[PDB]
Amino acid sequence: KPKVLITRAIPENGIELLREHFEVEVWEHEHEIPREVLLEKVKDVDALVTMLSEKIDREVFDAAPRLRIVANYAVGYDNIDIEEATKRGIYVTNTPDVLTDATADLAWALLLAAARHVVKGDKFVRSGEWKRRGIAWHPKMFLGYDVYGKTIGIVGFGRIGQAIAKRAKGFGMRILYTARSRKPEAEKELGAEFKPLEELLRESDFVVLAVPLTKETYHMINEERLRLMKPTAVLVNVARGKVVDTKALIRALKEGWIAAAGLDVFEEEPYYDEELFALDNVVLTPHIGSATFGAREGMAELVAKNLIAFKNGEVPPTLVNREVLKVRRPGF
Amino acid sequence: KPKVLITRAIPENGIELLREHFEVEVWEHEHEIPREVLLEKVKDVDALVTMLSEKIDREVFDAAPRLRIVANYAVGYDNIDIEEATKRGIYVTNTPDVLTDATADLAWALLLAAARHVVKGDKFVRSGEWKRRGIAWHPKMFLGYDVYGKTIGIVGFGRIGQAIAKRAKGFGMRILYTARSRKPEAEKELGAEFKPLEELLRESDFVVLAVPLTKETYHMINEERLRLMKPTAVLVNVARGKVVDTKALIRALKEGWIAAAGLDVFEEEPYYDEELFALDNVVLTPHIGSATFGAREGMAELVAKNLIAFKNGEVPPTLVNREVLKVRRPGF
Ligand SMILES: NC(=O)c1ccc[n+]([C@@H]2O[C@H](COP(=O)([O-])OP(=O)(O)OC[C@H]3O[C@@H](n4cnc5c(N)ncnc54)[C@H](OP(=O)(O)O)[C@@H]3O)[C@@H](O)[C@H]2O)c1
Ligand SMILES: NC(=O)c1ccc[n+]([C@@H]2O[C@H](COP(=O)([O-])OP(=O)(O)OC[C@H]3O[C@@H](n4cnc5c(N)ncnc54)[C@H](OP(=O)(O)O)[C@@H]3O)[C@@H](O)[C@H]2O)c1
């Protein structure tokens, strides 16, 4: 009976389903499994369920001679060395689709919060500042940015990006996108227009990032790109922190190159930066894009389905490295 | 040349347009005009531009013998004694439409922030607590409520309510509404379904209030209605504070009768309440529904147009108390 290590307490639906087909060890602690502890525990396993926090690299593969499949509890897989996995006949799966709507909802929450000063406004009320000042209402108090009918620019036009666009249609927006290729069916269905990155940045009132982290997306939103954005524009990052040059973003926010930003993801996590966190025109969330009951349950069910399919000699439904099919047939 | 007092520093477009046709006094101070000061200044005026903060009642009318028209810098007019105005031949105008998109955007900002813990999350990051606890990401961290595909119940289905529904369509929602009359064109255009209030409250995952304050809407969201709502539901109030029984809402939030609330408006303003302000599951904004430059500019242009139309012997374009037309012809 094959052994699986699950590196965090995922929802019980997934754990229980895996227990029917695997011997299951779960890392029970809130904190990330320590690196030395991971390398010790993988020695014996046939499968892994990993979080974005575990770096599944050559060193891990060398420590886990029986390892045949890694199911990421995440749609991103920048934490896994995919090419090295393929070379070794190791299957890698992810969790697309089940978290699309949670992440797109969160991107929209950030867009609107940053646009209309929701965080600063809440503190203004909650701290008693509103009351202490004695002024109920003023025609110039807390003026923010219109969203309805404006232009949204979506960087990355896959599952999450297109979901962000569906919501934008409810807001009557002009929709621009960039991607590695045109998406002509999505253009027709969503009314979206393909643009080079730099033209998108120049024309957009709202820029939302929904790309994977790759060599090519690393620091794509740098100083030069931030300078192209409108001074009234709002930037939202629900992708990966390293897509943005944080030092450049801090200058942009402080000096008024852009109006505001909503950030769910950071170059190091958990993140603290005194300079960024002092700014009224940033809205911050602790990497909670996929944090709904429904999404996290669906993720758990999907990691389980992938490992069970593999055990049954089937191609896992959300296999990422399809080239591995030529290296080794599925199964333990 | 007729005299107008404008009780707040509204956008210059409106003030300047009025200066072409009226002798204009503007109350330019940060604080609202004191009651005793208002009663002194109205003695001499032919017209007023008022904010929601000024109570235009029998006492004001008795102090202002030349007063023929009051233009509220607001779509709401619960601060004006309309029946007494009509009896005296005084025309009352408001600012519909020009602020609809700002207010509906803000309602959506509140809905999403309350649903996904944006305010609480921001403080968790900004304070350094996220970093100090040392955990980047966890499958159970900050789980919130799915919005896409859920049911929204919109209480009041006029200009702002229908705008809230247009946005909901981008979120693929089932749309319920209640109002004093059925809206068959809106049903066809928006896919919205009419329900009695109590069925709407039972069936909705998100309830948004967009009614005026009247004798009938006063405390309509009371203990009984909050108990009918789902324990997972989110309530958003962009209407008037007095539509909700705040004491009952506090019990509902604390005891889990509903999940969360987003509030832009309160029974007293500015508002202070230690019990409500202690709650993680409320999101607060300081009555900033119409707070975009474009909304506020349009409001200013519209108050000016109303007073100028009246001066010209025309029916003002956003006259509220149309029965006054039988009492006195327009003009000074
Ligand atoms: N904040 C969170 O909690 C959270 C949650 C889930 C996901 N995420 C992040 O969101 C990412 C996207 O997920 P998804 O399901 O939408 O993935 P996806 O369907 O693969 O979409 C990614 C899109 O990015 C585009 N892209 C890739 N490299 C690009 C480049 N260099 N320039 C421009 N566009 C580029 C792709 O273009 P092509 O289609 O032309 O190849 C694709 O359209 C994940 O990889 C993850 O890092 C974050
Ligand atoms: N938070 C802010 O900054 C902000 C900004 C602007 C406005 N507001 C508030 O929002 C209100 C609505 O503005 P609007 O332009 O949408 O007005 P509206 O177009 O007159 O719409 C009001 C809707 O409420 C309905 N209604 C009235 N009494 C009701 C009751 N007892 N039960 C159920 N529905 C009832 C009306 O029914 P019928 O259609 O049958 O008449 C109508 O559908 C304003 O009056 C103001 O108080 C707040």
Author numbering:
A (entry chain B), B (entry chain A): 2 to 333
The paper states:
Glyoxylate is a small and very reactive dicarboxylic acid molecule synthesized by most eukaryotes and prokaryotes. Considered as a toxic intermediate, this compound is metabolized by an unusual enzyme assigned to the D-2-hydroxy-acid dehydrogenase superfamily, glyoxylate reductase/hydroxypyruvate reductase (GRHPR). First, GRHPR is a dual activity enzyme. It catalyzes the reduction of glyoxylate into glycolate, which is either excreted or reconverted into glyoxylate (futile cycle) and the conversion of hydroxypyruvate into D-glycerate, a precursor supplying in the gluconeogenic pathway carbon.
To go deeper in the specificity of these enzymes, we determined the crystal structures of PfuGRHPR and PyaGRHPR at 1.4 Å and 2.0 Å resolution, respectively. The asymmetric unit of PyaGRHPR crystal displays a full dimer. The electron density maps obtained revealed that Pfu and PyaGRHPR enzymes are in ternary (enzyme + cofactor + substrate/product) form. Neither cofactors nor substrates were added during the crystallization or the cryoprotection step. Both structures include a cofactor molecule, unambiguously modeled as NADP(H), within each active site with a refined occupancy of 100%. The PyaGRHPR structure contains D-glycerate, product of HPR activity as observed in the holo form of human GRHPR12. Contrary to what was observed in hGRHPR structure, both active sites in the PyaGRHPR dimer are occupied with a D-glycerate molecule. The conserved Arg241 was proposed to orient and to hold the substrate for catalysis through two hydrogen bonds with the 2-hydroxyl and carboxyl groups of D-glycerate respectively. Additional interactions for substrate orientation are provided through carboxylate oxygen atoms forming charged hydrogen bonds with the main chain amines of Val76 and Gly77. In the PyaGRHPR structure in the presence of D-glycerate, the network Trp138, Ser291 and Arg297 superposes strictly with the one identified in the human structure.
